[PDB]
Design an enzyme around this catalytic site. Structure first.
Site, PDB file in Angstrom:
ATOM      1  N   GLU B 286       0.873  -1.165   0.000  1.00 57.00           N
ATOM      2  CA  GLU B 286       0.000   0.000   0.000  1.00 57.00           C
ATOM      3  C   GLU B 286       0.910   1.215   0.000  1.00 57.00           C
ATOM      4  O   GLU B 286       1.812   1.301   0.837  1.00 57.00           O
ATOM      5  CB  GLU B 286      -0.947   0.017   1.209  1.00 57.00           C
ATOM      6  CG  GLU B 286      -1.995   1.149   1.155  1.00 57.00           C
ATOM      7  CD  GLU B 286      -1.619   2.357   2.011  1.00 57.00           C
ATOM      8  OE1 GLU B 286      -1.725   2.269   3.256  1.00 57.00           O
ATOM      9  OE2 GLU B 286      -1.208   3.391   1.439  1.00 57.00           O
ATOM     10  N   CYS B 320      -2.181   8.314   4.418  1.00 55.70           N
ATOM     11  CA  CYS B 320      -2.327   7.891   3.035  1.00 55.70           C
ATOM     12  C   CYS B 320      -3.703   8.229   2.479  1.00 55.70           C
ATOM     13  O   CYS B 320      -3.852   8.338   1.256  1.00 55.70           O
ATOM     14  CB  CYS B 320      -2.053   6.391   2.920  1.00 55.70           C
ATOM     15  SG  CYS B 320      -0.364   5.942   3.448  1.00 55.70           S
TER      16      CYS B 320
END
Ligand SMILES: O=C(O)[C@@H]1C[C@@H](O)CN1
Ligand SMILES: O=C(O)[C@@H]1C[C@@H](O)CN1
Lengths: 532, 535
Positions: B286, B320
């Protein structure tokens, strides 16, 4: 859904009459098979031929290789169709594959069986369990798994509702299928398409006739244009082209380890150009074992090993090529193997239904297998016990060969031959545990294996010791013939990524889920109460 | 089967036991430096490569001294993990799950204040950001992954006479390298914990700037019964760690969260070394985002403002999932701009341990401060950019950055494309009648696909935007902010450059860390090798 029945093809049965008629229809025929991009039939000047393995004077198909420019045009057209296809409800896409399954089960069964027999050299039963049963099951079971997956949804807590959308991958998937199972090509292209992807399918040159028959059935069952492009191509040209596209999002591969590693490395070299990280799935073969304990049922060892080693000429990723036998049982097993070997009929499977197996697939396979037979005539540790003959004047005919090795780690015990070549290693009864460790340590592969034993404690011990020697592991059954929904198929070590086609999780490799949270009340202040 | 629910978020009201417990834990850390060794098996190991973790809001406070594992120690940790793997993999899944369920109970109760306080002092989080991370999300990962894994064993194939079929969910053969980021204590626990739950052994390289809390989580796992050599605690220089694990023939997986270039680098190293591995390693990553809030003219203005302020500026925008581009129609921009600027002036930036009125604190370290400062200077030089609020920074005491709101006249300005990971929100105002064209720009402007939100009360607009933004966000929000996914409710991840989208927090994540075996046992003799049709 339930598994498709395996028909018996008894004398006077409807399926045997239908099959014989389909074979008669094909006997003197060559089909001109174009590339298909959208609904356009495209011919290039790079003409190729598929030959009947048992009668290589018979060109069963004329086809052509898509060049780089045609492949790139096929990518562009598929990408333009993807959004509409991905937005279709999962049940609407599933309906295409369920209708295709019903066509394969009924009115098209004889056609796809006969094309697999004449084009790939399969006998009746090997075509039936492949082009009919396994392919039908892939389509029905994957459709079930996909419809069920839509029901796997997250927890919702007021005042918010959560919903998972199982998106197709953004881009196109390249499907690269092998010669040896018609069903695998159907699955490699079909399962990604089911999940909302668009696909460039490069079928195997030596399976073109049956592969195109499957393609046409999918189109007739309602697959829209540009969802699967039918693009035979030179292997390196195809791999170079798809790994050069910024829109590649997956490769669904079955074939050799070196080719899969090459594609993997091409993707890695080109990571900076792709819009997303491509997903590589590969099943890459095996060097599979039958391990016999002194308590085994000899008759089952013999028939299971003869079938696993020699059906379809040993040309299975799952075929037994190393047999481990205790010295105490070797006189029985050797005697029975050699007597039954003399009864195996190799010949034309379309003309003689008494044929056990037929010619191997092509001149390259024939040459590779002959090199291994010549090695078996040279090595001080190897002895050919039966067979060893080959003749390519009419078809690519290799007799079944049984070899004994005195060296449990001879190259022939390690390297995949993909031919009807069985090597036996005889171990001392008291060295049983040491030999189990050899089964695990000798090869780089981890696909299938079997243990024959009637002793519960022995089976439990072997199961633990061989846990990573086989991803499909068999107790008192042969190492081939996995059935969709019953034995999901695949293994690790050098045998591939083990995504288990035939089980419920395979389709997850071809979806990229999106989670949508919808909140039905105003958000309120940005501060928190503890701050006051 | 297992019954679990999400961990309740605590209120930390005045006089509450959890507020008192946290204030005591913070007091216990204020003047302290913890010496954190590498742990291989049960051995504390020190190397000469001494490193320090600093408190982001008071960088004179070294909160931890640790060391980088050298290549010899990393290879020793691999060997010892491999020698422990077979026994751990053969344990019943329920027995492995019990370790994580016990760890979750410890984090929920007696250790809650400790891990919250270490995340606050070490990573700069406020109370509530530490609570949703080091407590709620990490606890939820441990409990829900345990539930998912126990239930996975019940997913078994069909059996037909004369044979019985069973699927064994084997761990991967080899070791997994877990590489975790600074910004969520929970992510490190999941990256190492989820593969270990599935029967793997792990080399865990935690983030330098989250070392204190990461070691707290590690100790809790060991106290909960994690056997030695199942997770090796090996802080290390990033390149050195990647070089070592990708050079081992026994690598079977990398579980990564961090930057796109680092993930690509590891992917290429594995591809280069493909010929030495025993199996094909599995890479999960990720890799961040450039996330959007899209506003339609039918939106609730109050929700847009508070949702965007939270998404853009909580934890200093170091998520994020944080919103860094806001798309506003010209008709609502007067109302939204005035409310944003008014609320902006009320945002308190300061010391989160000393002042619970703090909205967010300093950014994580000097490198992030320097990067954000260059972007603020770009916003002062670009003809298409104008700073509407904020813009100052000061690193004399902590790495302090004001929340900054910038308006861009150019929808394709570099500040609309590149991930800053700071408290920097860019607004693009679009003409109402160009909302369809603007939705295409939302989708095409960046290389990322992680989170995004649409604010609209018109049902048709919501449906239209949901279709057009299908691949612009793997976590998509309707009338809520783009941050704060909850385990079991919004499984988290996205595609495009944002990573492999394996959706940690959902039921399928654990499937990346198992390699199934199917066993068929046949209970009757096989009979002849011929078939009846051959007669
Ligand atoms: O087990 C076998 O022999 C076949 C070949 C693969 O399609 C999987 N099932
Ligand atoms: O949505 C968010 O902000 C956090 C970050 C990840 O740990 C997933 N949940």
């Amino acid at each position: 859904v339930a598994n498709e029945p395996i028909l018996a093809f008894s004398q006077g049965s409807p399926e045997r009459d239908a099959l014989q008629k389909a074979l008669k229809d094909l006997k003197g025929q060559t089909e001109a098979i174009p590339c298909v991009v959208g609904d356009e039939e495209v011919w290039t000047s790079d003409i190729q031929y598929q030959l009947s393995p048992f009668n290589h004077a018979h060109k069963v198909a004329k086809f052509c290789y898509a060049d780089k420019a045609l492949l790139n045009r096929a990518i562009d057209a598929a990408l333009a169709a993807r959004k509409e296809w991905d937005l279709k409800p999962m049940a609407d896409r599933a309906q295409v594959f369920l209708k295709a399954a019903d066509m394969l089960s009924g009115p098209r069964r004889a056609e796809v069986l006969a094309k697999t027999m004449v084009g790939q050299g399969k006998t009746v039963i090997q075509a039936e369990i492949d082009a009919a049963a396994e392919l039908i099951d892939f389509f029905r079971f994957n459709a079930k798994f996909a419809v069920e997956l839509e029901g796997e949804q997250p927890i919702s807590v007021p005042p918010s509702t959560n919903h998972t959308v199982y998106r197709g991958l953004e881009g196109f998937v390249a499907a690269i299928s092998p010669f040896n199972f018609t069903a695998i090509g159907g699955n490699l292209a079909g399962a990604p398409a089911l999940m909302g992807n668009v696909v460039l399918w490069k079928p195997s040159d030596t399976a073109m006739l049956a592969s195109y028959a499957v393609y046409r059935i999918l189109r007739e069952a309602g697959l829209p244009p540009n969802i699967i492009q039918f693009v035979p191509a030179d292997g390196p040209t195809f791999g170079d082209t798809v790994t050069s596209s910024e829109h590649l999002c997956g490769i669904n591969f079955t074939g050799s380890v070196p080719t899969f590693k090459h594609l993997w490395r091409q993707v890695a070299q080109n990571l900076d150009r792709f819009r997303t990280f491509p997903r590589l799935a590969g099943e890459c073969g095996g060097k599979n074992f039958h391990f016999v304990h002194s308590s085994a049922d000899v008759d089952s060892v013999v028939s299971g090993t003869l079938r696993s080693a020699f059906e379809y000429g040993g040309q299975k990723c799952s075929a037994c090529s190393r047999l481990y036998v205790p010295k105490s049982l070797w006189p029985q097993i050797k005697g029975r193997l050699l007597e039954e070997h003399s009864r195996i009929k190799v010949g034309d499977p379309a003309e003689d239904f008494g044929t056990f197996f037929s010619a191997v697939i092509d001149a390259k396979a024939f040459a590779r297998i002959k090199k291994w037979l010549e090695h078996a005539r040279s090595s001080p540790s190897l002895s050919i016990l039966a067979g060893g003959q080959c003749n390519e004047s009419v078809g690519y005919y290799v007799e079944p060969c049984i070899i004994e090795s005195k060296d449990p780690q001879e190259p022939i015990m390690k390297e995949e031959i993909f031919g009807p070549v069985l090597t036996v290693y005889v171990y001392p009864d008291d060295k049983y545990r040491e030999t189990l460790k050899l089964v695990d340590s000798t090869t780089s592969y981890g696909l299938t294996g079997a243990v024959f034993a009637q002793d519960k404690a022995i089976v439990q011990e072997a199961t633990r010791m061989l846990r990573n020697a086989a991803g499909n592991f068999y107790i008192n059954d042969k190492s081939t013939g996995s059935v969709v929904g019953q034995q999901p198929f695949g293994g690790a070590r050098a045998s591939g990524t083990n995504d288990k086609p035939g089980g419920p999780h395979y389709i997850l490799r071809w979806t990229s889920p999106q989670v949508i949270k919808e909140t039905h009340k105003p958000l309120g202040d940005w501060r928190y109460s503890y701050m006051q």
